[PDB]
Every structure is written in structure tokens, then in C-alpha cells.
Design a protein around this ligand. Structure first.
Ligand SMILES: [Cu+2]
Ligand SMILES: [Cu+2]
Ligand SMILES: [Cu+2]
Ligand SMILES: [Cu+2]
Ligand SMILES: [Cu+2]
Ligand SMILES: [Cu+2]
Ligand SMILES: [Cu+2]
Ligand SMILES: [Cu+2]
Ligand SMILES: [Cu+2]
Ligand code: NA
Lengths: 278, 279, 280
């Protein structure tokens, strides 16, 4: 699409933690509509977000965010009493800031990047059970002028599953040749993984796109990741390669053999996918 | 050192998959010349490569490449019917492109980098058996103006082996002090590793060399890598450190202890290596 | 903040390998004062360091450094006889260099970075026993103009411990809001880890700080690391987030559950830490 605007808006959302079928737990923006991964939160540097949070579960839960600014009262840990008791409510406050020159001449890094939020108190005091059960979601913070995508897809390697899905059950994502597609890639649990995409590649830097001819970042199609790592990128679907059912998978061999695979289904403008028969 | 020219040539090559001794399999450019790792393929951005492929083994095999442009018919997977039956032949086509500005002003990244190719169908439909057996090889794509090396060596951490060699059997690589030496480093299998070189270091970026004083890339001598990761770099052999049998190894302690170790043998101009006495 | 000057000095230090309580082993700059991690060595690009080394132990030991310039005789390995026999002495020499252009015009990377030293011969020919026992320490090489910190803290994930400490025993580090705090982060052993710091973030590049608005490095608060990896960064304590007990931990879930955790204790300018009430 276009470009991200300058931030500075004070935003507000309601968030709920809720049980889902099969022992799962999820975040949602409306009661009864929790999802795994949780809802995508998008902010422009400078924006503030007040998360009006409610725990609808029978066990305590919390909300811990990576990368963004928050005071200790929004750490989301039992250790500083910022979790939410069953049936309880709490306002978590997330802030973001633009980069800038400090008075002493140093450069303050901004909040922009591919981040995520997750539980920190279900099962253990590091949220091992909550994360296992699905209490995680993506956060994107944009810098003014960042290129905006046609669509964004979140892929979470959570131990031996993608997005808590059963082995060999996706997710699949659909695009048309030429679409600007953004991927947010988060890892959770116990294991390291390597994320691989067939037919596409990106830059190993903040936006996943080279800034121009002077950017020396490695261009990659395979990336090692460990628990609580996050990164993201944009690709032009099918660019230089055409339509097709382009696989993505963890490249740890036993993981790909045991279901950590999905498809990036890139259609021609006429809606067909060459060589794909499901 | 020389410099890579602009690409745009159409090239052909023949490649075979063959069984090797002891359950191994490898790729080669000629029959009976299969090797692990497979042959090094070097391209300049814009080059097209037609790989005339032949499966001489008794089980299906394929060729899947990282990084390069290919249509879905050269994916090299059973899922897309781009594998090769026993005794069969197939032409895989790889393309590359230069970076440049798109119609809308965004910057399209080029193909240049350190890449690799491997099997995708032996044992499992992700090539777990074929990769284990040795079916992997390096691909280098160069950008116009890239610095060219005096020699290139490929180091593959394939599970707990280097290049499928028996434990504690190298490989070793020879150079003379001052040689410009290129390393392609690929990882395969189940395990993470950390690649370490004694006496040398490189930049954690596309070429392994800093572009100049503005490049903030960390300079490293140790790098974590996982299955199907690839990177590469160039060093000046012995620069600031002199001749010697310079160790490289995985730094995961049990892996180095079990034999994931080799030597970068850097000779003085008279050909000697001080303090080198292999046992 | 201060700024690093150009290097070029020749320095010498004594270092000792010593047994410590509980079967541990450490390096120290004075006899009887070994520590785990070993002493922080700081150099400016161009400096030379002569390490006058003594093995006080009953087993061979060595000193292997990452990143810095050294000849094969200071490799610290048995195979080229650069280890130190029990009771023995040896001078290890480390050199560093500035970046610049070679005679052919190519750019040579300098020595600056976050590095480390460790044993290479105790237990195995790769120092597996020595590293496990505590024979590791940090080295920082600074480039002219690098920002200098108010304090530097070294965090080593040595297998399932931080700095060889028992589980759930820190270390904790103290600062005041606004302090410029440098972290050196080293990993050793058999396992991968992911280092995470609550409330703070850094740039994934040489210094951990962006050079300016044109540096495209990812800004992160979580980093995967494996044996013998080293990186570092600086943060302004509490910047944009305030005082408090800010946790750092490995984010591998069973590792944090088993106590690879510590606290960055950031005090208010009046000396208090909000929300931090540790049990007696
Ligand atoms: Cu935490
Ligand atoms: Cu995996
Ligand atoms: Cu986290
Ligand atoms: Cu694949
Ligand atoms: Cu290894
Ligand atoms: Cu692959
Ligand atoms: Cu070594
Ligand atoms: Cu850990
Ligand atoms: Cu080491
Ligand atoms: Na980088």
C-alpha cells in the first residue's frame, strides 16, 4: 500500500484472555472471539496503547510485551504483581517512541520493529503453560515512512506446532502474484527452529527489505530462531518465480517430517495455481 | 584480487546423482566423479543456469536450491512433481537477478549471496535421508564488482559430521600467508552448531567483508547456524597472525570433542607450517 | 559520556589459573584472587597485551582468545604446544589493529568488538572441563570514539548456569535510572539459549547502538546464542520505562523455569526501587 504516518495517537483496546476448545487459551479483542495467535496490534512510533484487559479464565493470567515501552506496573509478571487474577481487570499501558539524537550526541533507537506479547504466569512464573496453550500474539510498530503491505500473516513456531495447529494442518496463506505480503515470524517454547520459504527471500534487517544499494545485510531464505525471537519482512508474492504452492517450513529435518509445514498459495490473476492439486 | 563482472549469460551443466560407498550418495558433474559436498556452482547476477540432471540411483532423487529464482517446476519436490525417477533425466532451470529500483521506487534485492542445493525426496518428502547421505552442495551468486578470491572451500556441518567425513578426519584446507580465501559454510540435518575459526574473523553481512567505515555489522569469529543455513566470507590467510595450522571447528563442546574439527593449514612463502605435527 | 581514545599502547598483566572451592577453576590477575567469570580485559584498537601467565594447578591449562590477533604460539592449544604445564609459566601475547585500507584499497576490519577468552585443554583438547569449571572471561576491544559506559556487567550462560552460579541465585546487577550500562554476553557449553531483557532493547550490531538514522540493524530484546558466541550492548537504565527490578533471563522456557534468571535492579534517583519487595 502506501507509507506509515507519524505516530502520537493515544489508542485504546479491550483484550480478553479466554479458554478455547481442547485445553487451549487465547487472547481476543471481543468476548468469545479469542484466537491463536492473538490479534495483531499495529502502532506507529509515538503511539500509546491502553489495553483494557479482562481475565475470563479460572486461573491467573498476564500480558508481557517485547520491545515496547512500559513501566514496571505493566511488566505482566507475578514478581511485581502485574498479573490478573481470575475474573479480574487491569489496564496495561504500552508506549512507543521515535528515534532521535540525545543531547550528548548519541542516537536513541526507536520502538519500530516486529514484536510480540504473551502470558507470563500460567503454569509457571514464566508463562510456560500459557504460551503452550496459545497465549501469544504479534505486535508491529512502524516508523514514519515504512512501506505498508497488502496483507500480513503471522507464523508462530510454538514448540513442535505452527500456531498451535495439529501437525500437517497448515496454516496456508493465499496471495496473488505481485501482492506485497508481510510475514511476522515468532518462536516460542523449548526448541530452536529454522524458518525457510521456497521461492522467496528477504533481507536480514529491521524491515526485512534492503534500504537501497548501500545496505550490506545478508539476503536469506532460511533463519535460525529460538524461544521469544521475533522478526518480520515483506516479499512481493511470486516475484521472479511465478505462481505456485510455495512451501514454507521449519528446516530442522525431523520437524518438517513431523508436520511443521505450510503453503504460501500464490495465484495467477486468473485465480489458478499451476501444479497444485489439493 | 579481481572483480566479478556483470552477469546475464545463459549456461548449461550436467549433474548426476550417484550412490557412493557405504550408503552415501552424492552429486557430480561427470559420471563416477560424484563428491560430498557436490560441485561448487558460481554465477553472476543475471546468469541463467540449465542443470541437465540425471538420476543414476535406484530410488527417486531431486534438486532443490536456496536463494536463486526458479519456477515451481524446478522446486525439486515430489509435492510439485519435480523429482526425478530412478534412471530419469530432468532439466532444472535456475535464474538470478540484479538488484534495482522497482516501478514504484522500492528497492528489489538481488540474488547475490552464499546459497546451496540439496535433495528433497530421498527417505522423506523433505529429503531427510538424501541430505544425511550426502546430497548437498554450494552455490555462490556474485554481484558485479564483488571481490574475487584466490580459492574457495566449502564446509558443511551435516548433523555431527563435516562434509560426511569420518570423525576427526578433517577436511583440511591449504593456503599461503596472504592468500584471499573464501569460505562457504552450510548446515544440514537435525542439530544447531556454532562455527569457529582460530586466528581469523569476518563481518556478519552478505559478503563477510565490511563495505567501509559506515558498515556497523558485528565482526565475529563464532556463528550459530541451524539446518539449511548458509553464509560465507573471505579472509586474508594469516593476516596479522602468521602461518600455522589454524583450527576451525564447531564450538558446541561435545561436537568438537567427537570430531567436528578441521585445519586451515596456512604456509609461509617457503611452504612450511611452524609447529604442525599431525598425529 | 566518555569516548575511547586511539590505541597503540603496549601493556602487560599477570594472570593465574587457580583452583577454586567446589572443584571449580578460575582466572585472576592476582594470586589468590581468581574469579568466575575471569577478569574483564579492556583494550583500545592498536594496543598490545602481554599476558604473563602462570598455571598454579595440577593439570595442564591454556588461554585461548577470540577475535584478537595472536600468533600460533599464543593459540592456547596442545596440538601446537601453546598450553601451560602444571606449575608452568608462559607469556601469551594478544595484538589488536585499527580498521583501514590495505595497499590494494580493500577495507580491513578492525579488532573492535565484544570477545572472550577461555581454556582449551582441561578435560578435553577443546577445554570442555576447563570451561565447565569456570575458565572463561570477557575481553572488550574499543574503537576510537566508541561510547564509554558508567558500568560493565558480564553475563555468561555456561550450560545451565549463569556465571557458574546455582539456579535462582542471580547474579543481580544494580544501577540508577539514567546510568549507561554495558552488558557483555557470552555463551558456553552444550546448549543454545536466548537472552532476553525486560524493559530494554538494543541494536543487533557491533556496539549494540545504532550509528544514526541510516543504520538498518534490527532492534531486539531477545537473541539466540550458542557455545562461544559473544555480543554486547549498552542501554540507558530505565530509559522510557522507569525504575524497578527488571528481569533478564534465558527465554528457553524450561531454562527460565529452572532458574537461569537474574535482576537488573534499577533504582530511582532517590535510591528506592518501586515494586521490589524480596522475601527476607
Ligand atoms: Cu520474562
Ligand atoms: Cu523446527
Ligand atoms: Cu517473552
Ligand atoms: Cu523445502
Ligand atoms: Cu556442532
Ligand atoms: Cu533446503
Ligand atoms: Cu578451538
Ligand atoms: Cu537457556
Ligand atoms: Cu572458544
Ligand atoms: Na546485520
Amino acid at each position: 500500500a502506501g507509507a506509515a504516518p507519524a505516530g502520537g495517537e493515544v489508542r485504546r483496546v479491550t483484550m480478553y484472555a479466554e479458554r478455547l476448545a481442547g485445553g487451549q487459551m487465547g487472547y481476543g479483542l471481543e468476548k468469545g472471539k479469542a484466537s491463536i495467535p492473538g490479534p495483531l496490534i499495529e502502532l506507529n512510533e509515538g503511539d500509546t496503547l491502553h489495553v483494557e484487559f479482562e481475565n475470563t479464565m479460572d486461573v491467573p493470567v498476564s500480558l508481557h510485551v517485547h520491545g515496547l515501552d512500559y513501566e514496571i506496573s505493566s511488566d505482566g509478571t507475578k514478581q511485581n504483581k502485574s498479573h490478573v487474577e481470575p475474573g479480574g481487570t487491569r489496564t496495561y499501558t504500552w508506549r512507543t517512541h521515535e528515534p532521535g539524537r540525545r543531547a550528548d550526541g548519541t542516537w536513541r533507537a526507536g520502538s519500530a520493529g516486529y514484536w510480540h506479547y504473551h502470558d507470563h504466569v500460567v503454569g509457571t512464573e514464566h508463562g510456560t503453560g500459557g504460551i503452550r496453550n496459545g497465549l501469544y500474539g504479534p505486535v508491529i510498530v512502524r516508523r514514519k515512512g515504512d512501506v505498508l503491505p497488502d496483507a500480513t500473516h503471522t507464523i508462530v513456531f510454538n514448540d513442535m506446532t505452527i500456531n498451535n495447529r495439529p501437525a500437517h494442518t497448515g496454516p496456508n496463506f493465499e496471495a496473488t502474484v505481485g501482492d506485497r505480503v508481510e510475514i511476522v515470524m515468532i518462536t516460542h517454547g523449548e526448541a530452536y527452529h529454522t524458518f525457510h520459504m521456497h521461492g522467496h527471500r528477504w533481507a536480514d534487517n529491521r524491515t526485512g527489505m534492503l534500504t537501497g544499494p548501500d545496505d550490506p545485510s545478508q539476503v536469506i531464505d532460511n533463519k535460525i530462531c529460538g524461544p521469544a525471537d521475533s522478526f518480520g519482512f515483506q516479499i512481493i508474492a511470486g516475484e521472479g518465480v511465478g505462481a505456485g504452492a510455495w512451501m514454507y517450513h521449519c528446516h530442522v529435518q525431523s520437524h518438517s517430517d513431523m508436520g511443521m509445514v505450510g503453503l504460501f498459495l500464490v495465484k495467477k490473476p486468473d485465480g489458478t495455481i499451476p501444479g497444485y492439486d489439493p
